[PDB]
């Protein structure tokens, strides 16, 4: 468990925050939000919870991600979770969080394949995290089922747009492997909001369920559909493994064995897997935080130059100075 790529950046944020708080001002540390776009049952929730490093989201066959859960990670001194609709309660166990999320979804949408545009706001405080926004959006579908209205397709798409047309957002586009990449909706959306690939990261899931004799070797090499940041393959837990309470360590070991043994992927083994995605996102955040330094320097330099002309005289103030008095008199 855990995510150790945060540890090397947290003290940088703290030091910058302290440097600005010294003057009664904040730091414009506008880190990008992370939005996970995907088709229904593409695996977009298991990827997200593998980036956080905690097993707390509901996942599984069927329509589970019924509401647009928004997770806020706030750096703190201890570890706890809270909900805006459960104000005053404290959650010390992620299993309770998962069960409460399910109960809150059912309470509003019912037991059919319902949806609700209103998000759930879950905030987790921990000394090991950064101030991040994570958005788990409901998967897109083509036809209504259950008691959904005829426009279910358009309501879901509209829920996505308000979160991915915003600047400073990473579109983490998840598509299954045992399907044809040309028919992945997540990539159609990315091309509608990021016409040139600067933020979009491709992730290919379900590589272990490919039809025997076929592989995706020409997809992972960024040949079929060029994407500025390529595609990162991952292997998540299967439905049997979720129901079997499979450990996370075993899943990572199985993923590593899969890539090391597969005849068509050995040469890419060091470019794929869960920990590689963690490094890519952490590197993306680090590149962002460094890119803003010229603005902070220019603001501070301008303020310093503005005050210096008067500081030069204030620093020379003395309780007894007949020349200072005379200068003021003449002026």
């Amino acid at each position: 468990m855990g995510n150790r790529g945060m540890e090397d950046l947290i003290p940088l944020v703290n030091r910058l925050q302290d440097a600005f708080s010294a003057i009664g001002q904040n730091a414009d540390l506008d880190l990008p939000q992370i939005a996970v776009v995907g088709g229904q049952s593409a695996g977009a929730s298991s990827v997200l919870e593998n980036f956080v490093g905690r097993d707390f989201l509901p996942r599984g066959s069927g329509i589970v991600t019924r509401r647009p859960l928004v997770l806020q990670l706030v750096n703190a001194t201890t570890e706890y979770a809270e909900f805006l609709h459960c104000k005053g309660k404290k959650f010390t166990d992620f299993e309770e969080v998962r069960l409460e999320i399910e109960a809150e979804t059912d309470r509003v949408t019912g037991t059919n394949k319902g949806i609700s545009p209103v998000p759930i706001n879950l905030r987790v405080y921990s000394p090991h995290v950064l101030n991040l926004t994570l958005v788990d959006l409901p998967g897109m579908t083509k036809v209504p089922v259950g008691d959904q209205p005829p426009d279910i397709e358009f309501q879901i798409r509209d829920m996505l747009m308000q979160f991915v047309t915003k600047e400073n957002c990473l579109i983490l586009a998840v598509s299954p492997a045992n399907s044809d990449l040309a028919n992945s909706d997540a990539l159609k959306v990315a091309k509608e909001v990021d016409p040139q690939g600067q933020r979009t990261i491709g992730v290919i899931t379900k590589l272990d369920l490919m039809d025997e004799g076929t592989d995706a070797r020409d997809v992972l090499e960024n040949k079929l559909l060029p994407l500025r940041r390529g595609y990162i393959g991952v292997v998540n837990r299967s439905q049997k493994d979720i129901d079997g309470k499979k450990d996370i360590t075993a899943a990572l070991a199985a993923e590593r064995k899969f890539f090391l043994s597969h005849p068509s992927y050995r040469h890419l083994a060091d470019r794929m897997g869960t920990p590689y995605l963690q490094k890519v996102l952490n590197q993306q955040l680090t590149n962002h935080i460094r890119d803003t330094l010229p603005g902070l320097r220019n603001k501070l330099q301008s303020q310093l130059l503005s005050i210096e002309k008067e500081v030069e005289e204030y620093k020379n103030f003395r309780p007894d100075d007949p020349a200072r008095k005379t200068k003021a008199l003449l002026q």
């Binding site: 940088l12 030091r15 910058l16 302290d18 440097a19 600005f20 010294a22 003057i23 460094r290 330094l293 902070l296 320097r297 501070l300 330099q301 303020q303 310093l304 005050i307 210096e308 008067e310 500081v311 204030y314 620093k315 103030f317």
Partner: peptide, 27 residues
Amino acid sequence: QAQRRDEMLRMYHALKEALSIIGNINT
């Protein structure tokens, strides 16, 4: 006037400290 002087000097030193920290953070 005394209060304005004191605030200007405090802000001056704090801004100098902020630059001395940011430059070291960038490395």
